[PDB]
Amino acid sequence: HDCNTTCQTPKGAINTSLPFQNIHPITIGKCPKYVKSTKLRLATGLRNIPS
Amino acid sequence: QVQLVQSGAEVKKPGSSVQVSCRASGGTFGNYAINWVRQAPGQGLEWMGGISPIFGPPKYAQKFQGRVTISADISSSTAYMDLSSLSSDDTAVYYCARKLEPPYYFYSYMDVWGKGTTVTVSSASTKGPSVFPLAPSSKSTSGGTAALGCLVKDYFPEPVTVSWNSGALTSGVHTFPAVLQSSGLYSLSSVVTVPSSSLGTQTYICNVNHKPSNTKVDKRVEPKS
Amino acid sequence: DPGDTLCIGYHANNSTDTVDTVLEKNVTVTHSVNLLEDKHNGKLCKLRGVAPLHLGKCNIAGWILGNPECESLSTASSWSYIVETPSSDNGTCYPGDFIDYEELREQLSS
Amino acid sequence: EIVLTQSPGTLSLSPGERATLSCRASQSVSSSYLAWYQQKPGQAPRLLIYGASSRATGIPDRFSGSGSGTDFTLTITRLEPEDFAVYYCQQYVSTPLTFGGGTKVEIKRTVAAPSVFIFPPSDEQLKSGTASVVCLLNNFYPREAKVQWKVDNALQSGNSQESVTEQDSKDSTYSLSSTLTLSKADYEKHKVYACEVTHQGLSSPVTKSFNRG
Amino acid sequence: GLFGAIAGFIEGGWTGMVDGWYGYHHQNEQGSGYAADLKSTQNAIDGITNKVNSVIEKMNTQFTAVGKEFNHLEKRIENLNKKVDDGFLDIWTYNAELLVLLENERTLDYHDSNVKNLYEKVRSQLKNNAKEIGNGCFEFYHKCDNTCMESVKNGTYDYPKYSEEAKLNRE
Amino acid sequence: GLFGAIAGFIEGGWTGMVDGWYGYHHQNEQGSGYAADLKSTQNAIDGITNKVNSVIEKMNTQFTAVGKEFNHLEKRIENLNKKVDDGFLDIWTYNAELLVLLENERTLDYHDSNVKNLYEKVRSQLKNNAKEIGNGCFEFYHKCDNTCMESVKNGTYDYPKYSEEAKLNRE
Amino acid sequence: GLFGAIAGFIEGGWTGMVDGWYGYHHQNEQGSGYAADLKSTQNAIDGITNKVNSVIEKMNTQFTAVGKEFNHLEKRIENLNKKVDDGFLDIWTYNAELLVLLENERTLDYHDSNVKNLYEKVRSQLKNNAKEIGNGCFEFYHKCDNTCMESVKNGTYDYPKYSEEAKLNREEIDS
């Protein structure tokens, strides 16, 4: 496709500043580290305890 | 150094989506709120929403509920305004803007603006302008002076740039704001008032330029009976 | 005489984001941010702004030797990576060994 | 909600003069969570006042905010030429953030009637099956102007289209250009084409016209 | 919670305070409402912002191409390349998972600490001019108008100004 | 240590409380003895349980065979393979060691925090109906039968019910 | 800080207390000066010392030669060797950076905890014999000579010895 990327995988390009990815271990470019995780969600706000 | 850098201006067909970027370049991104404000052509300012990436989730106005989403990429120091409640009256200039001195994590007022990204929602497609002359005459004269001009008709999209005698002629020129026709194309007129005597002797050429279609026309304008 | 009161408290909202902690799983927080990129565009893009060389139904051997099935391929003067398909097997149509083939492939990748 | 209406939509004043803009709110307003912006055409806003009367750094002293509750005012004490622009008021006590309609301060000046010209369509255009007649009002003030088209005395109704310039840097006058477009068919079917202009510095509507020939 | 405030002696959160993480609810004769504490919120935002940017930006990887190609007589180095690829996967996966777990735990504690401290800053100003009625609330032993309330949020509450009135009602 | 309770203002532990991590000792007219606080203990156990399971289970390795064989003319790749094996050894050793150190520290604070909060929940109930006599004990200023004791453990102690009697002995 | 004391209710530090991390300042009739709390300081020193040695000594690297040499027809393994080196580089850098950041935070909290605990330990001794005047100072409701001050620092303050005098001055001052 006539698109730009900085990190290409066999199944699609990734455009991201995030430090990790679970798309594919075999990549080309300046890429995030492959991990096996399915969720790396960092909390910033607080515990949510509505009324 | 603290500046917000908007994405390039864009033209999308009705029904589809647009995404506008806005890269901050100063300090550590994330601890300040970025607002997204929109301005239709010759219209007021409406606030769509905004985000402070870390304080909490995006907050939106009901006008755009379900049609807009705002996100942010915390590393790349960038916020994105995605709009795909697309119509033709979503055509406007889109500003991202923030407060500068703290506390600035919430949506308050705004010291610092981007330059804006103009966005035109039109099912038209690129077209060069045809250029006709507005000839002076005995009906385009009054006292010492007389008016002549160029009509820049049926072009898409904005903008056009007009100069007279390749920048030589300045005084008394009025290039009008273009208008959107029923065909979905723009037309504008450019006009000069000149001494009536200078007709015949001095030769007037308007230089039209439409970069989006790479057409550069130079039309000489002659008197008539 | 019920005196005026001032209470300290903290934000809560309608968010359903959950996060895990060392002591507790599935903790609902008012906001959170994702660290894991888990989506792609389903496309093979230009890298460094340079399009890849696509070999269609040919492999590198076939392309670089000029297998007649590869004549229709366009070859730019530069490219950022190479793409083959899993069914690309127009290679050495006359059988034999391609010496140091993988080394050549690596040399030609960009 | 909390919508803010500004009064008046336009404000005509000559330089050196006090301008006082107002901004009224549909709901009271939290202390002083009201800002004032200044937009000149083609640019993004500049922040003038925050709080309600707190002047933003950079802003010259002539600008001063005041008011509280549902009534705020922005006062400019000496209009400089730079100060002529649109001024929006904005609230921020609660989401959703809402702005005002905006007031445009324009340069007041002596009444000046337009020079009116008319341009029959070019031959070049006429070969392409449509005809555009341009009527031009040059150097008029105030901006309030009415343009009617009549062809063979018949008042055209859905096919004209105006567009006005912005106040001139030098003589701070306006200029206007409406154009009437017809099929070459209809253009050739009629003889006399006139645009009738009704301004206030024109004792009585001057109509310029031409015969097709 | 590590410090006992959030989900602790202050039982629940406030859907009515939308402008900040921590803040105040007051009721006096002239009115009632929520107000976020802007200073402590911005500080926490700054702290948490620094943390997120830290976790993201300290990873600065170089341009590499992961893939390697081996022929049928190079299986040993092919499995070596896989051992490498698999080793990194295990390392990054373990550390990314645990890192998040640990910082998420630390982040919630931090909020807990900030609320506790906010409460303590108020208790320390009021001393006995109010009664600690639990759930994070103080009941004043004197009339407290909006001016008074603001001094408390800003930390310039005048204990002696109200000390006489309070002692009367306390007795 | 961080919170001051364990080995802090409560100097030592109780070999006599065998049914839980944290708990209570009472003596009144109808008796005396230890009783574990079941809720807070179970909560901590669930927390630490989750903690142990995370450290173990977040490691999800694939089927691999570490050994590799190289002939006498492949010394360089043999040393590459050795560099691989030793780098992994160094990483895992460092990270496992530090991980354990950190979580062990975090675990001790956590228990410490829990004891502190327990004490605080009681102190907050009793107010001046009892005297804080240090070492984590409260001496009641009124008669406290078993029902009363349970209300304290239950978080439903009735301060106004006993406040008069308490004020009397307190004079 | 996490515990609210350092840069908290005790607003600033003492350049005049040079013999310890945490300690005491007193002023009475016979004088005034600083004194470090030696026990709490040594304990904290022991903790941080142990911490530093752990971060340093748990790393026990073996003898290696990183460099590898490949000829022009061994580019693939050269890139594998580089991927190894770059992979290690990325890991150690990320882990060292975060490690330092996390432990620095833990270290500052620790000091903060220690000061709070010292303050609380004194408050628990003094009880109603003094007034908490904020900023970490206690103003005694009775005369406290050098012997008295030391008992507080050593943890043997005799509450009942001074309770009467204090009660007189406390209800006198509170009118």
Side-chain angles (χ1 to χ4, degrees), chain D residues 112-137:
Chain D
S115 321
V116 182
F117 307 98
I118 188 162
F119 297 109
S122 51
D123 325 79
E124 199 169 323
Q125 182 194 0
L126 234 69
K127 299 187 295 188
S128 51
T130 58
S132 308
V133 193
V134 174
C135 173
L136 152 74
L137 318 206

PDB file of all heavy atoms in Angstrom, chain D residues 112-137:
ATOM      1  N   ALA D 112     -19.537  56.683   2.706  1.00  0.00           N
ATOM      2  CA  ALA D 112     -18.939  56.730   1.371  1.00  0.00           C
ATOM      3  C   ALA D 112     -19.666  55.803   0.419  1.00  0.00           C
ATOM      4  O   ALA D 112     -19.637  54.592   0.610  1.00  0.00           O
ATOM      5  CB  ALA D 112     -17.472  56.327   1.409  1.00  0.00           C
ATOM      6  N   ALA D 113     -20.235  56.333  -0.601  1.00  0.00           N
ATOM      7  CA  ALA D 113     -21.049  55.526  -1.487  1.00  0.00           C
ATOM      8  C   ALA D 113     -20.189  54.736  -2.465  1.00  0.00           C
ATOM      9  O   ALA D 113     -19.081  55.147  -2.794  1.00  0.00           O
ATOM     10  CB  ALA D 113     -22.014  56.402  -2.247  1.00  0.00           C
ATOM     11  N   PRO D 114     -20.667  53.596  -2.936  1.00  0.00           N
ATOM     12  CA  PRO D 114     -19.859  52.771  -3.833  1.00  0.00           C
ATOM     13  C   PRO D 114     -19.772  53.332  -5.233  1.00  0.00           C
ATOM     14  O   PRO D 114     -20.737  53.859  -5.770  1.00  0.00           O
ATOM     15  CB  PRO D 114     -20.616  51.446  -3.868  1.00  0.00           C
ATOM     16  CG  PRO D 114     -21.936  51.764  -3.465  1.00  0.00           C
ATOM     17  CD  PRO D 114     -21.904  52.918  -2.560  1.00  0.00           C
ATOM     18  N   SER D 115     -18.629  53.159  -5.854  1.00  0.00           N
ATOM     19  CA  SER D 115     -18.592  53.194  -7.299  1.00  0.00           C
ATOM     20  C   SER D 115     -19.161  51.877  -7.773  1.00  0.00           C
ATOM     21  O   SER D 115     -18.812  50.843  -7.214  1.00  0.00           O
ATOM     22  CB  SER D 115     -17.168  53.379  -7.799  1.00  0.00           C
ATOM     23  OG  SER D 115     -16.462  54.283  -6.983  1.00  0.00           O
ATOM     24  N   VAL D 116     -20.128  51.902  -8.686  1.00  0.00           N
ATOM     25  CA  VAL D 116     -20.757  50.678  -9.186  1.00  0.00           C
ATOM     26  C   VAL D 116     -20.393  50.449 -10.646  1.00  0.00           C
ATOM     27  O   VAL D 116     -20.657  51.299 -11.497  1.00  0.00           O
ATOM     28  CB  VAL D 116     -22.276  50.724  -9.035  1.00  0.00           C
ATOM     29  CG1 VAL D 116     -22.865  49.434  -9.516  1.00  0.00           C
ATOM     30  CG2 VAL D 116     -22.650  50.985  -7.615  1.00  0.00           C
ATOM     31  N   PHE D 117     -19.835  49.286 -10.945  1.00  0.00           N
ATOM     32  CA  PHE D 117     -19.474  48.887 -12.294  1.00  0.00           C
ATOM     33  C   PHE D 117     -20.207  47.612 -12.666  1.00  0.00           C
ATOM     34  O   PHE D 117     -20.652  46.877 -11.796  1.00  0.00           O
ATOM     35  CB  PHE D 117     -17.982  48.654 -12.430  1.00  0.00           C
ATOM     36  CG  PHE D 117     -17.139  49.799 -11.972  1.00  0.00           C
ATOM     37  CD1 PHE D 117     -16.577  49.795 -10.721  1.00  0.00           C
ATOM     38  CD2 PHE D 117     -16.891  50.862 -12.797  1.00  0.00           C
ATOM     39  CE1 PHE D 117     -15.798  50.822 -10.299  1.00  0.00           C
ATOM     40  CE2 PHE D 117     -16.109  51.895 -12.377  1.00  0.00           C
ATOM     41  CZ  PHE D 117     -15.567  51.874 -11.124  1.00  0.00           C
ATOM     42  N   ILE D 118     -20.346  47.348 -13.961  1.00  0.00           N
ATOM     43  CA  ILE D 118     -20.936  46.092 -14.408  1.00  0.00           C
ATOM     44  C   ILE D 118     -20.133  45.527 -15.571  1.00  0.00           C
ATOM     45  O   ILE D 118     -19.627  46.268 -16.416  1.00  0.00           O
ATOM     46  CB  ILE D 118     -22.408  46.264 -14.764  1.00  0.00           C
ATOM     47  CG1 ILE D 118     -23.007  44.902 -15.027  1.00  0.00           C
ATOM     48  CG2 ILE D 118     -22.509  47.126 -15.955  1.00  0.00           C
ATOM     49  CD1 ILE D 118     -24.467  44.906 -14.955  1.00  0.00           C
ATOM     50  N   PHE D 119     -20.000  44.206 -15.596  1.00  0.00           N
ATOM     51  CA  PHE D 119     -19.149  43.518 -16.560  1.00  0.00           C
ATOM     52  C   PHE D 119     -19.918  42.449 -17.317  1.00  0.00           C
ATOM     53  O   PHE D 119     -20.260  41.403 -16.730  1.00  0.00           O
ATOM     54  CB  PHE D 119     -17.986  42.857 -15.839  1.00  0.00           C
ATOM     55  CG  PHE D 119     -17.077  43.810 -15.165  1.00  0.00           C
ATOM     56  CD1 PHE D 119     -17.055  43.890 -13.800  1.00  0.00           C
ATOM     57  CD2 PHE D 119     -16.160  44.531 -15.880  1.00  0.00           C
ATOM     58  CE1 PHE D 119     -16.193  44.733 -13.167  1.00  0.00           C
ATOM     59  CE2 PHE D 119     -15.309  45.399 -15.249  1.00  0.00           C
ATOM     60  CZ  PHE D 119     -15.320  45.490 -13.889  1.00  0.00           C
ATOM     61  N   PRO D 120     -20.161  42.620 -18.612  1.00  0.00           N
ATOM     62  CA  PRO D 120     -20.794  41.550 -19.363  1.00  0.00           C
ATOM     63  C   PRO D 120     -19.870  40.378 -19.523  1.00  0.00           C
ATOM     64  O   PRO D 120     -18.635  40.535 -19.586  1.00  0.00           O
ATOM     65  CB  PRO D 120     -21.084  42.213 -20.719  1.00  0.00           C
ATOM     66  CG  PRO D 120     -20.065  43.276 -20.815  1.00  0.00           C
ATOM     67  CD  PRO D 120     -19.829  43.777 -19.448  1.00  0.00           C
ATOM     68  N   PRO D 121     -20.401  39.161 -19.662  1.00  0.00           N
ATOM     69  CA  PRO D 121     -19.557  37.974 -19.697  1.00  0.00           C
ATOM     70  C   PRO D 121     -18.609  38.026 -20.875  1.00  0.00           C
ATOM     71  O   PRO D 121     -18.838  38.735 -21.851  1.00  0.00           O
ATOM     72  CB  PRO D 121     -20.553  36.824 -19.804  1.00  0.00           C
ATOM     73  CG  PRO D 121     -21.740  37.398 -20.322  1.00  0.00           C
ATOM     74  CD  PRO D 121     -21.811  38.811 -19.857  1.00  0.00           C
ATOM     75  N   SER D 122     -17.491  37.332 -20.736  1.00  0.00           N
ATOM     76  CA  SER D 122     -16.493  37.332 -21.785  1.00  0.00           C
ATOM     77  C   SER D 122     -16.968  36.468 -22.922  1.00  0.00           C
ATOM     78  O   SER D 122     -17.797  35.575 -22.761  1.00  0.00           O
ATOM     79  CB  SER D 122     -15.185  36.712 -21.352  1.00  0.00           C
ATOM     80  OG  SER D 122     -15.483  35.460 -20.783  1.00  0.00           O
ATOM     81  N   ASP D 123     -16.336  36.660 -24.057  1.00  0.00           N
ATOM     82  CA  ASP D 123     -16.670  35.830 -25.190  1.00  0.00           C
ATOM     83  C   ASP D 123     -16.173  34.430 -24.923  1.00  0.00           C
ATOM     84  O   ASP D 123     -16.922  33.454 -25.030  1.00  0.00           O
ATOM     85  CB  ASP D 123     -15.986  36.415 -26.403  1.00  0.00           C
ATOM     86  CG  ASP D 123     -15.942  37.912 -26.338  1.00  0.00           C
ATOM     87  OD1 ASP D 123     -15.065  38.443 -25.601  1.00  0.00           O
ATOM     88  OD2 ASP D 123     -16.796  38.547 -26.990  1.00  0.00           O
ATOM     89  N   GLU D 124     -14.914  34.344 -24.506  1.00  0.00           N
ATOM     90  CA  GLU D 124     -14.249  33.111 -24.118  1.00  0.00           C
ATOM     91  C   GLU D 124     -15.154  32.242 -23.257  1.00  0.00           C
ATOM     92  O   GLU D 124     -15.331  31.053 -23.530  1.00  0.00           O
ATOM     93  CB  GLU D 124     -12.944  33.486 -23.424  1.00  0.00           C
ATOM     94  CG  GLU D 124     -11.901  32.393 -23.337  1.00  0.00           C
ATOM     95  CD  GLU D 124     -10.533  32.935 -22.882  1.00  0.00           C
ATOM     96  OE1 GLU D 124     -10.169  34.066 -23.291  1.00  0.00           O
ATOM     97  OE2 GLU D 124      -9.828  32.229 -22.117  1.00  0.00           O
ATOM     98  N   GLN D 125     -15.777  32.822 -22.233  1.00  0.00           N
ATOM     99  CA  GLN D 125     -16.660  32.022 -21.392  1.00  0.00           C
ATOM    100  C   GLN D 125     -17.893  31.592 -22.157  1.00  0.00           C
ATOM    101  O   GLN D 125     -18.382  30.471 -21.986  1.00  0.00           O
ATOM    102  CB  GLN D 125     -17.131  32.811 -20.181  1.00  0.00           C
ATOM    103  CG  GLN D 125     -18.009  31.975 -19.282  1.00  0.00           C
ATOM    104  CD  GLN D 125     -18.749  32.806 -18.291  1.00  0.00           C
ATOM    105  OE1 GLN D 125     -18.609  34.022 -18.267  1.00  0.00           O
ATOM    106  NE2 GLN D 125     -19.554  32.164 -17.467  1.00  0.00           N
ATOM    107  N   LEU D 126     -18.393  32.462 -23.022  1.00  0.00           N
ATOM    108  CA  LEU D 126     -19.652  32.195 -23.684  1.00  0.00           C
ATOM    109  C   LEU D 126     -19.565  30.995 -24.604  1.00  0.00           C
ATOM    110  O   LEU D 126     -20.579  30.331 -24.839  1.00  0.00           O
ATOM    111  CB  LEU D 126     -20.072  33.432 -24.450  1.00  0.00           C
ATOM    112  CG  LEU D 126     -21.468  33.868 -24.056  1.00  0.00           C
ATOM    113  CD1 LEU D 126     -21.473  34.382 -22.649  1.00  0.00           C
ATOM    114  CD2 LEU D 126     -21.872  34.962 -24.982  1.00  0.00           C
ATOM    115  N   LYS D 127     -18.363  30.657 -25.057  1.00  0.00           N
ATOM    116  CA  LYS D 127     -18.183  29.473 -25.876  1.00  0.00           C
ATOM    117  C   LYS D 127     -18.370  28.207 -25.061  1.00  0.00           C
ATOM    118  O   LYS D 127     -18.658  27.153 -25.629  1.00  0.00           O
ATOM    119  CB  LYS D 127     -16.805  29.523 -26.536  1.00  0.00           C
ATOM    120  CG  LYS D 127     -16.657  30.740 -27.443  1.00  0.00           C
ATOM    121  CD  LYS D 127     -15.379  30.788 -28.282  1.00  0.00           C
ATOM    122  CE  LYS D 127     -14.120  30.915 -27.463  1.00  0.00           C
ATOM    123  NZ  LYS D 127     -12.955  31.153 -28.360  1.00  0.00           N
ATOM    124  N   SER D 128     -18.296  28.297 -23.740  1.00  0.00           N
ATOM    125  CA  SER D 128     -18.403  27.114 -22.909  1.00  0.00           C
ATOM    126  C   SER D 128     -19.779  26.952 -22.275  1.00  0.00           C
ATOM    127  O   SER D 128     -19.906  26.270 -21.257  1.00  0.00           O
ATOM    128  CB  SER D 128     -17.339  27.170 -21.825  1.00  0.00           C
ATOM    129  OG  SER D 128     -17.413  28.414 -21.170  1.00  0.00           O
ATOM    130  N   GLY D 129     -20.803  27.601 -22.816  1.00  0.00           N
ATOM    131  CA  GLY D 129     -22.162  27.234 -22.464  1.00  0.00           C
ATOM    132  C   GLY D 129     -22.728  27.794 -21.181  1.00  0.00           C
ATOM    133  O   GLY D 129     -23.859  27.439 -20.822  1.00  0.00           O
ATOM    134  N   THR D 130     -22.014  28.684 -20.503  1.00  0.00           N
ATOM    135  CA  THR D 130     -22.574  29.414 -19.381  1.00  0.00           C
ATOM    136  C   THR D 130     -22.123  30.859 -19.458  1.00  0.00           C
ATOM    137  O   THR D 130     -21.124  31.175 -20.105  1.00  0.00           O
ATOM    138  CB  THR D 130     -22.142  28.807 -18.055  1.00  0.00           C
ATOM    139  OG1 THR D 130     -20.707  28.809 -17.995  1.00  0.00           O
ATOM    140  CG2 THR D 130     -22.695  27.364 -17.895  1.00  0.00           C
ATOM    141  N   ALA D 131     -22.895  31.740 -18.817  1.00  0.00           N
ATOM    142  CA  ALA D 131     -22.653  33.178 -18.837  1.00  0.00           C
ATOM    143  C   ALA D 131     -22.709  33.764 -17.431  1.00  0.00           C
ATOM    144  O   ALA D 131     -23.662  33.503 -16.696  1.00  0.00           O
ATOM    145  CB  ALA D 131     -23.664  33.872 -19.737  1.00  0.00           C
ATOM    146  N   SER D 132     -21.651  34.465 -17.028  1.00  0.00           N
ATOM    147  CA  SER D 132     -21.567  35.081 -15.711  1.00  0.00           C
ATOM    148  C   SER D 132     -21.447  36.596 -15.807  1.00  0.00           C
ATOM    149  O   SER D 132     -20.479  37.109 -16.375  1.00  0.00           O
ATOM    150  CB  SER D 132     -20.376  34.517 -14.960  1.00  0.00           C
ATOM    151  OG  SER D 132     -20.446  33.117 -14.972  1.00  0.00           O
ATOM    152  N   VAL D 133     -22.438  37.310 -15.286  1.00  0.00           N
ATOM    153  CA  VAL D 133     -22.411  38.768 -15.235  1.00  0.00           C
ATOM    154  C   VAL D 133     -21.978  39.204 -13.845  1.00  0.00           C
ATOM    155  O   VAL D 133     -22.564  38.786 -12.844  1.00  0.00           O
ATOM    156  CB  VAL D 133     -23.761  39.386 -15.600  1.00  0.00           C
ATOM    157  CG1 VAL D 133     -23.574  40.864 -15.848  1.00  0.00           C
ATOM    158  CG2 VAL D 133     -24.309  38.724 -16.798  1.00  0.00           C
ATOM    159  N   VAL D 134     -20.961  40.048 -13.778  1.00  0.00           N
ATOM    160  CA  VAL D 134     -20.402  40.532 -12.529  1.00  0.00           C
ATOM    161  C   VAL D 134     -20.794  41.984 -12.310  1.00  0.00           C
ATOM    162  O   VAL D 134     -20.571  42.821 -13.184  1.00  0.00           O
ATOM    163  CB  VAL D 134     -18.878  40.394 -12.554  1.00  0.00           C
ATOM    164  CG1 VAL D 134     -18.302  41.015 -11.360  1.00  0.00           C
ATOM    165  CG2 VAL D 134     -18.497  38.951 -12.612  1.00  0.00           C
ATOM    166  N   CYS D 135     -21.321  42.291 -11.125  1.00  0.00           N
ATOM    167  CA  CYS D 135     -21.619  43.652 -10.680  1.00  0.00           C
ATOM    168  C   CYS D 135     -20.694  43.904  -9.497  1.00  0.00           C
ATOM    169  O   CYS D 135     -20.550  43.037  -8.639  1.00  0.00           O
ATOM    170  CB  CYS D 135     -23.116  43.783 -10.285  1.00  0.00           C
ATOM    171  SG  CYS D 135     -23.814  45.308  -9.484  1.00  0.00           S
ATOM    172  N   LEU D 136     -20.041  45.054  -9.460  1.00  0.00           N
ATOM    173  CA  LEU D 136     -18.991  45.324  -8.486  1.00  0.00           C
ATOM    174  C   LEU D 136     -19.231  46.643  -7.773  1.00  0.00           C
ATOM    175  O   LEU D 136     -19.405  47.665  -8.432  1.00  0.00           O
ATOM    176  CB  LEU D 136     -17.639  45.353  -9.181  1.00  0.00           C
ATOM    177  CG  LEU D 136     -16.611  46.227  -8.491  1.00  0.00           C
ATOM    178  CD1 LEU D 136     -16.148  45.528  -7.269  1.00  0.00           C
ATOM    179  CD2 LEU D 136     -15.454  46.527  -9.385  1.00  0.00           C
ATOM    180  N   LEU D 137     -19.309  46.623  -6.441  1.00  0.00           N
ATOM    181  CA  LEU D 137     -19.421  47.840  -5.634  1.00  0.00           C
ATOM    182  C   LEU D 137     -18.060  48.156  -5.021  1.00  0.00           C
ATOM    183  O   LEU D 137     -17.556  47.395  -4.200  1.00  0.00           O
ATOM    184  CB  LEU D 137     -20.472  47.721  -4.534  1.00  0.00           C
ATOM    185  CG  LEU D 137     -21.823  47.073  -4.800  1.00  0.00           C
ATOM    186  CD1 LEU D 137     -22.863  47.584  -3.865  1.00  0.00           C
ATOM    187  CD2 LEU D 137     -22.233  47.328  -6.171  1.00  0.00           C
TER     188      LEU D 137
END
